[PDB]
Design an enzyme around this catalytic site. Sequence first.
Site: not given
Lengths: 418, 409
Positions: B204, B258
């Site tokens: 990811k 983030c």
Amino acid sequence: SKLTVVGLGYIGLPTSIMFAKHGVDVLGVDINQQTIDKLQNGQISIEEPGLQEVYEEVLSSGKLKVSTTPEASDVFIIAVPTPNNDDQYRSCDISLVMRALDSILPFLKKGNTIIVESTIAPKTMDDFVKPVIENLGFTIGEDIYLVHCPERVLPGKILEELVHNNRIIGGVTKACIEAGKRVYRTFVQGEMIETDARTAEMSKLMENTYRDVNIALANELTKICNNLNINVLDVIEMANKHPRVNIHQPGPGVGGHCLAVDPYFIIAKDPENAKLIQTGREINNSMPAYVVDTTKQIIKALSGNKVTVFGLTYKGDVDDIRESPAFDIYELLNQEPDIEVCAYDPHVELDFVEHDMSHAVKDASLVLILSDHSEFKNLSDSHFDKMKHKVIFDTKNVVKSSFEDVLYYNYGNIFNFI
Amino acid sequence: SKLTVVGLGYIGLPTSIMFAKHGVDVLGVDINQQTIDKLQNGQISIEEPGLQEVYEEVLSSGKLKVSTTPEASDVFIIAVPTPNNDDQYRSCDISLVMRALDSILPFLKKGNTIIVESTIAPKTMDDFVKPVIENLGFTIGEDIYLVHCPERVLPGKILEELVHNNRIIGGVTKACIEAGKRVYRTFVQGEMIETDARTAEMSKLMENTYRDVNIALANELTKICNNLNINVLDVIEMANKHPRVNIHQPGPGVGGHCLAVDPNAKLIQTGREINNSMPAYVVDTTKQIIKALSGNKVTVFGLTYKGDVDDIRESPAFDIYELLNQEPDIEVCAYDPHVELDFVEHDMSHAVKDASLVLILSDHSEFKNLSDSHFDKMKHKVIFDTKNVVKSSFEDVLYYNYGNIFNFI
Ligand SMILES: NC(=O)c1ccc[n+]([C@@H]2O[C@H](COP(=O)([O-])OP(=O)(O)OC[C@H]3O[C@@H](n4cnc5c(N)ncnc54)[C@H](O)[C@@H]3O)[C@@H](O)[C@H]2O)c1
Ligand SMILES: NC(=O)c1ccc[n+]([C@@H]2O[C@H](COP(=O)([O-])OP(=O)(O)OC[C@H]3O[C@@H](n4cnc5c(N)ncnc54)[C@H](O)[C@@H]3O)[C@@H](O)[C@H]2O)c1
Ligand SMILES: O=C(O)c1cccc(C(=O)O)n1
Ligand SMILES: O=C(O)c1cccc(C(=O)O)n1
Ligand SMILES: O=C(O)c1cccc(C(=O)O)n1
Ligand SMILES: O=C(O)c1cccc(C(=O)O)n1
Ligand SMILES: O=C(O)c1cccc(C(=O)O)n1
Ligand SMILES: O=C(O)c1cccc(C(=O)O)n1
Ligand SMILES: [Eu+2]
Ligand SMILES: [Eu+2]
């Protein structure tokens, strides 16, 4: 009717041979007398299968003559090298191209075409070639034609590649573009992409840059993954399942080619604007030391000092040791005390390189794979019998044959050893 | 079977609705009382087209109940936010995930499954979640199942994507993967990729990293090309003809999210720094256009990151608008058909009325085929397209993009 090719290496010699094969009177120009003597004695100065046969036909027809000096011609093709500058960004050195441009200048006549096939930094044609020519009694697109057509040859298939590849014709003016098409139309069956010189320059360097930054990403990720006991190769394969995600393969570093950075404007005048490219280069430059540090740790856990390097070239199945991360590792390992290094490369003919595998692996604690040579794909336990410890650290992920006696490591699982 | 979803935002609420729509008894858990009151009154707390309709069905069936407190359950899904830390990386804050975990711990029973759908740094499941659970006496893969299932849905297509999108099931053990598959098989028709938790976390982070570094490359190249009077777009199109070259498109920046690293990563950091600098690069270019022309009025076209989507969250387009708003000597006016806000002006004509520059920041479908008729009110008919969306050729309007803005100066 007449063409001069300046520079007779891997690009220039087959190109001269190609135009001469099609009835053009070609004068091959090279400053290396050894090269010229070889050529004048009927032998090709490069290693390319089938070329010697083509050269023999063309030399006998009187279409290809060679010299150390240029002479008056209709078309001039500069195919000299563009070495890498001793700088961070690895900028292309245009010095041999400019020296080659100066050799051509006294022979220039109105109507002539100058093609630069060598790798050039963006704005070379416009800011460096054009002012030199305009300083003489010349107008670009009127009196002389300035074309940048980047040449890239496929070894083993050079002549076929020269005919069938799509070609970028980067003219300084729209007239220059037409002059470029006229030249290549002789044998080029591939598509001819028309554009201006600056677009042709920038494009080829952006190709190199996309590749360098992406390799840096893979290499940086390898360092992270090794620290967290994560397999980098399995995760790249996982992540690349996304249609728009194409993470590259990590390795021992990057060699050869130069990037989309002109030594002046985007280094000397605006370097913070090339921050990603610089970082990518820094990461790629740090891989030889990362491989050396990993090697030092393997050799610490095992009895012995002997490390056998497998491959000294950047690309696989090539004899080019120039700007090689594999050679950089060998040299660092050689310099390093407490490590006895032995290089093995079937493609490299240097004195110090060990010609026989069995003799090279003899009493070695680790086999270090730094090049993706075809020969390294199909290696069995039989090849490594003479080793003190049958361990392989493959920085290229080239070995496709599974072992039993031999302990095989990747960038994906090297953390298991330590 | 009973399922608790911890965190009822854009991820958690539709996921709650989805399992309950398929007969599972769902308890939605959220710490925001305003959210819970809205939900308990019958209204969705999140803005998504036909969701209210599906929520109404599911609330009436008694399959979806909401609370501020978790309760004993078979499956627990953590879908809380992972805010940006401060931090030079704006790294993922795992604090709300850990707090959510802590709130579930007293209700844990043997056989339970914990799924973390929130963005987490690699080794969170193994080094942070696993030790906490094992401290209670639970054995992972035997009496508790730990799964990382990163959730990613496209606004407007949320329920459709929950079913049809492929899913990475990252189990701590092979048994955890099986437990993850049983949970999602309820409604997931998409492919379920089986792997371990660390591979799901890393994968990811690598997807967003490849994407960000490549966008940064395109954006950095745009700055270089503009300095050398080279067309960047023509050059990307040229270079991408190579089968192994896939240079991305430049733009006004990237929708902030983030970095899922634990607070060298030098390239990743640089890539995010370059993308963060794009709003200011667009603003500086705008200031120069407005200097050469008479007027102060700049009309922003698009306030969202993704075209044809209500993507205003951490939006670079929105950030440019506010920077232009903050900037004196510049009168800004925003136009977006997809965003409904107090400052989103009268439908196009009134937004342009006396503007000296139209700044396109979103690639909305509406912006593709655009006539001269639309800009007929402007003080100066000039367009600076940071997205290269306008395809309709026109006379009298001066069209600029990343590829040719150096021509105006
Ligand atoms: N080989 C490729 O497919 C490749 C790929 C991309 C780009 N290029 C570009 O082409 C350049 C040359 O490639 P190559 O592989 O043929 O290099 P090469 O070293 O094999 O050949 C260069 C030849 O030019 C001669 N030479 C050098 N300076 C000269 C001068 N001033 N006048 C006349 N001759 C001169 C040299 O003696 C040498 O024989 C590269 O450095 C790069 O710029 C090559
Ligand atoms: N929206 C997406 O498709 C997206 C994409 C990638 C990753 N993610 C991950 O999922 C996270 C959440 O996404 P979102 O868009 O749904 O966020 P959101 O802000 O819309 O929803 C989070 C909800 O959780 C509630 N909450 C916070 N702490 C809680 C706690 N300790 N216990 C119970 N409830 C709590 C909040 O009150 C809020 O209602 C992101 O921050 C990221 O980690 C989301
Ligand atoms: O398209 C390519 O990548 C290419 C083309 C010709 C030669 C080479 C090479 O020598 O690496 N690479
Ligand atoms: O000039 C080249 O050969 C080149 C440039 C970018 C990528 C690649 C490649 O993947 O081979 N090759
Ligand atoms: O097959 C190719 O074209 C190739 C293979 C490896 C490296 C490169 C390169 O660096 O261009 N190109
Ligand atoms: O595959 C993608 O890029 C993707 C998938 C789902 C949602 C989103 C998104 O919201 O940006 N992006
Ligand atoms: O999370 C995402 O939406 C994402 C991640 C990597 C690439 C892409 C993409 O190319 O869209 N999208
Ligand atoms: O359709 C999508 O998935 C999409 C579109 C624009 C940007 C991104 C992204 O950044 O993931 N993803
Ligand atoms: Eu290549
Ligand atoms: Eu996406």
